[PDB]
RNA sequence: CAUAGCGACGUCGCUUUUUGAUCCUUCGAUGUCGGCUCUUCCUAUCAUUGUGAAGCAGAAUUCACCAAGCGUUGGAUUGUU
RNA sequence: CAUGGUAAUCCUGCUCAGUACGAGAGGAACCGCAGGUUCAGACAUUUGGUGUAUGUGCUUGGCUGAGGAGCCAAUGGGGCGA
RNA sequence: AACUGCGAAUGGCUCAUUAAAUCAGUUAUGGUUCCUUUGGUCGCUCGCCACUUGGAUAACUGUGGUAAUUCUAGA
RNA sequence: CGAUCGCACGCCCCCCGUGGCGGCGACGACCCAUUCGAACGUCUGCCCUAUCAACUUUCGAUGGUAGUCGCCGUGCCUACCAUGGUGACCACGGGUGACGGGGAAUCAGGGUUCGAUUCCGGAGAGGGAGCCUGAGAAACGGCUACCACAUCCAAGGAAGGCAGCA
RNA sequence: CGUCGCUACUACCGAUUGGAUGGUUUAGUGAGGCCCUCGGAUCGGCCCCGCCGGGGUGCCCUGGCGGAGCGCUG
């Protein structure tokens, strides 16, 4: 049962291959969006509290929050529920979804670290990938650079420097709104 | 679903009519609102043309007009006392268009002292003195007292309404349609209609 | 030691215990004893029988605020860069606004000269 | 090709599970058919064990020997045997 | 232990083997394995039956003034039941 | 590319159903709704952001599941 | 009771010197009117059949009263009442190898047959049934369920609707 | 002209509580949608307030960890 491990404060999600029942028993019979101390995955995962954020069934069916069962059910899914995007407006389609309780019968199990452990997981907590593009709204950059009122707002926007080999150098700035 | 078509009915001669099409949307129906009495709960349904209808599922207040006195106050509905259509609507306390209900007389009373300067519904007085003492005397001038005692000659209320004010509850007939407008507006029963409904309620019980 | 099954009452059914019932529609049920089997066959609802597990969990028998935000670097502006930008409070920003205002002032004087 | 398997014309026997023949016992009474149930016995063996023979290539079948240990059923119609 | 009784029986499938034999069509057997039929001797862990433990609920008519607790109706009836 | 808006209820096909039903002419909606167009109306209301307020989500980066789909999940 | 988007850009400067004014549009709107309509209504009109003469009426049949619901008028539905309503001037039932009409064939006059078929109106998308969105659908080159067919599967599931053009 | 005898064809009656395929329905079961009454897996705001902080001057303008107020709420 693979584990898709992701740390939001740095990004750098990674997939973990484990096959030990004893290691995975700490997750069993836990609902989604619950924080469980992931200290059963050896010494390296000690001191880690992780949140169960979802997964997929043995047949690739994603799990839906609030189903409150183990196994698969069929639900009439409307716009904006989960596990479904409407092909046309107002369309609702019946689909199969996995329950929120996790057991051995899964392919993956999406996990999100809530609080940091005592050491650094290799390839996970390091090499912090930045957020690509900064705020576009004027208020959202006022909050980010702590502006009071109208102090060089135009030039305090984030400029995106992009380079390619055949490209002649140039910077890119967004059209700031509101 | 619930259809309001005329083709499922028999012909005037009694012959069986055969439908030439399956059920159409514009000839639909919807479940009854069944407006009870309780905390305000109104549901919005979409209707033909994209307009809006209000399903008053539960109501507690309604705008009832005195009529004779041209007094229109937002008061509280207590219970349903009589319904011409069905007795079960009285038993289940369901608000429909023509059922008559008991409503509080407090705002109408307050308007009556504030306009006519007469006790109404009181038994002996001297019970709300820091307000009624002020509103009886008012130490007002000659012209204001001239207006007030000019308004005394027409300050007669029917003994039936006087009894209802003594009891503290007026009985009034709804005029709006809950489940269509989502409110319970109405008018205070008085005169011959009040006597007719009083005789109906008396003949029903006791 | 085999696969453990659950009954009409939700109890564990050990190997060699109870019966198993396969319906025509393709559903297979297993019962712990003839009491549960007779209750199921008489179409009695387990949520209304006091000793079944479903009733116990229906009647609850026997059994805060968090909001944290982090600051991250942006492509083209590191954490050091954004800290340098956002920590210009001690009247440096006043210098920026006043110099921008006076620069726009000579710009507006040029506009007035070339306008009328 | 008489005799693998049959056997005409004749002729010698065995059995008492057929029906007769007789009238010895029973007429101061031996309860008279069939079915059901249940046990045992016979072999003139349908099957099964071991065999011999064939017009026994195999398969199937037929004849015979030792042989009665074991088995020989469920029903429609009929009181039926 | 004298003596007496005595009991086990038959079939099918797989393999041998589409093999031997046969022009072909067809088509075995010995050893081995897995099971059944009839019979016999038991036994109740499980499944089923019984059930007046007159065990525990439900319920009709009646009776103890009512509640509670009960009883009668040749086992009142019914569900589950050691 | 995607979010949003609009269209997708027109067109095309066929004649099974349907015998005061459809339909044809006539008349009514003073018993109803109406996208769009066009034209009115939009300072009529006395009542520490307005030099412009808040949050999320697409598209996008990355990690995947299922044999499969115009399936989608986590970050 | 507009926190929207483009186009050229101009005017006032006393108070001053950074602010206030301005045109052309686009988008937008509660409501009204108009347009496109749609929906239910009024009167008259349809082939054969009595070896179909009495139908409707508990479960609405005809009407009244009060409501419910519907976009609205109405038994559309509910409650309480009344006993009505339709028929030899053919009711009701059955058949149709019946979608209706504008029309087509035949042609003294009168008629008799045919109109699935390009225009108008209606109905349906395999048979039913139920809904989301939207002004407008009971939509099917939208969804859901059953029934009948039927596609792929790694057997755990998934996907269907040519009475559109070929 | 009719019976009778032969050969064809066409219908008719006929035990068989005959047979088949449509259609309309009683009754029982009853998927699914819609509505109502509940329900509450989760997701947010306030009360943050264990603290460093604080400025018109312990009396916070709050710039964050953090417990969680174990409530009010949508
Ligand atoms: Mg903009
Ligand atoms: Mg003699
Ligand atoms: Mg004797
Ligand atoms: Mg004897
Ligand atoms: Mg012998
Ligand atoms: Mg011996
Ligand atoms: Mg023996
Ligand atoms: Mg009793
Ligand atoms: Mg008692
Ligand atoms: Mg007796
Ligand atoms: Mg029993
Ligand atoms: Mg629209
Ligand atoms: Mg037809
Ligand atoms: Mg035509
Ligand atoms: Mg047409
Ligand atoms: Mg249609
Ligand atoms: Mg459809």
Neighbours of chain A (3+ CB pairs under 8 A): C
Question: Would you call A138 an interface residue with chain C, using a CB distance cutoff of 8 Å?
Answer: no
Cα–Cα distance measured from residue A175 to residue A166, given in angstroms and rounded to the nearest whole number: 26
Q: What is the resolution of the experimental data for this entry, in Å?
A: 2.8
CA of B127 to C1' of G109 (A): 107
Q: Residue B20: which nucleotide is closest by CA–C1'?
A: F18
CA R_g for chain C: 38
Select the residue from A68, A125, A130, A157 to test the C interface by mutation, using most C Cβ atoms within 10 A: A130
Chain G nucleotides near the protein (CB, 7 A): 5, 10-13, 17-18, 38-41, 55-57, 60-62, 65-72, 74-79, 84-87, 91-93, 122-125, 128-139, 142-145, 156-159
Chain F nucleotides near the protein (CB, 7 A): 7-8, 17-22, 33-34, 52-55, 59-68, 70-75
Q: Which residues of A touch C77 (CB under 8 A)?
A: 134, 158-159
Question: Would you call A33 an interface residue with chain C, using a CB distance cutoff of 8 Å?
Answer: no
Pairing of strands A72-77, A93-98: antiparallel
Q: What angle do CA A99, A103, A104 make, to 5 degrees?
A: 130
DSSP secondary structure, chain C, as one string: ----EE-TT--EE-TT-SEEEE-TTS-EEEESSHHHHHHHHTT--GGGSTTSHHHHHHTT-------------BTTB-HHHHHHHHT-TTTHHHHHHHHHHHHHHHHHHHHHHHH-
CA of C55 to C1' of D47 (A): 65
List the beta bridge partners of residue C74. A131, C77
Q: What angle do CA C88, C89, C91 make, to 5 degrees?
A: 100
Name the strand (E) or helix (H) holding A138. helix A138-145
**Ligand 15 mean position to B19 CA, how many Å?**
21
Closest CA to A150 of C94, B153, B61: C94
Q: Which residues of C touch A147 (CB under 8 A)?
A: 93
Pairing of strands B36-37, B52-59: parallel
**Ligand 6 mean position to C97 CA, how many Å?**
130
A124 half-sphere exposure, CB direction, 13 A CA radius? 21
Residue indicated by tokens 């305000």: B40
B160 half-sphere exposure, CB direction, 13 A CA radius? 14
List the beta bridge partners of residue C92. none
For residue B187, the SS3 value is strand
Name the strand (E) or helix (H) holding A51. strand A49-57
Question: Would you call C76 an interface residue with chain A, using a CB distance cutoff of 8 Å?
Answer: yes
Q: Which residues of A touch C86 (CB under 8 A)?
A: 144-146
Give the method of determination: cryo-EM
Distance from the Cα of residue A70 to its chain's centroid: 23
Asked whether the CA dihedral B184, B190, B195, B196 is positive or negative, the reply is negative
**CB distance A128–C73 less than 8 Å?**
yes
């Amino acid at each position: 049962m693979k584990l898709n491990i992701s740390f939001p404060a740095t990004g750098c999600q990674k997939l973990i291959e484990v096959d030990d029942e004893r290691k995975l028993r700490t997750f069993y019979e836990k609902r989604m969006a619950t924080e469980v101390a992931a200290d059963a995955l050896g010494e390296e995962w000690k001191g880690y509290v992780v949140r169960i954020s979802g997964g997929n069934d043995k047949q690739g069916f994603p799990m839906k929050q609030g189903v409150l069962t183990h196994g698969r059910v069929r639900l009439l899914l409307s716009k904006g529920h989960s596990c479904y995007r409407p092909r046309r407006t107002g369309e609702r389609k019946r689909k199969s979804v996995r329950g929120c309780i996790v057991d051995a019968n899964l392919s993956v199990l999406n996990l999100v670290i809530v609080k940091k452990g005592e050491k650094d997981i290799p390839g996970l907590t390091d090499t912090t990938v930045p957020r690509r593009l900064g705020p576009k709204r004027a208020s959202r950059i006022r909050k980010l650079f702590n502006l009071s009122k109208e102090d060089d707002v135009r030039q305090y926007v984030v400029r995106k420097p992009l380079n390619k080999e055949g490209k002649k150098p140039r910077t890119k700035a967004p059209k700031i709104q509101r | 679903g619930i259809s309001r078509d005329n083709w499922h009915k028999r012909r005037k001669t009694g012959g069986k009519r055969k439908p030439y099409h399956k059920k159409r949307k514009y000839e639909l129906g919807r479940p009854a609102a069944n407006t009870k009495i309780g905390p305000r709960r109104i549901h919005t349904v979409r209707v033909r043309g994209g307009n809006k209808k209000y399903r008053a599922l539960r109501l507690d207040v309604g705008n009832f007009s005195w009529g004779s006195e041209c007094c229109t106050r937002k008061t509280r509905i207590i219970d349903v006392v009589y319904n011409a259509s069905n007795n079960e609507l009285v038993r289940t306390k369901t608000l429909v268009k023509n059922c008559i209900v008991l409503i509080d007389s407090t705002p109408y009373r307050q308007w009556y002292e504030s306009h006519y300067a007469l006790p109404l519904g009181r038994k002996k007085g001297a019970k709300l003195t820091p307000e009624e003492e002020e509103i009886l005397n008012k130490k007002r001038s000659k012209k204001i007292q001239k207006k007030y005692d000019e308004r005394k000659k027409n300050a007669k209320i029917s003994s039936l309404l006087e009894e209802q004010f003594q009891q503290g509850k007026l009985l009034a007939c709804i005029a709006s349609r809950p489940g269509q407008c989502g409110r319970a507006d109405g008018y205070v029963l008085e005169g011959k209609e009040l006597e007719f409904y009083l005789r109906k309620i008396k003949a029903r019980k006791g | 030691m085999k696969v453990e099954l659950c009954s009409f009452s939700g109890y564990k059914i050990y190997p060699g215990h109870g019966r198993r019932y396969a319906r025509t529609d393709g559903k297979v049920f297993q019962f712990l004893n003839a009491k549960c089997e007779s209750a199921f066959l008489s179409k009695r609802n387990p949520r209304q029988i006091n000793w079944t597990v479903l009733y116990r969990r229906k009647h609850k028998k026997g059994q805060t605020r968090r909001a944290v935000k982090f600051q991250r670097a942006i492509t083209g502006a590191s954490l050091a860069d954004i800290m340098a930008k956002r920590n210009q409070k001690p009247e440096v920003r006043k210098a920026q606004r006043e110099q921008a205002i006076r620069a726009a002032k000579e710009a507006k004087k040029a506009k007035q000269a070339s306008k009328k």
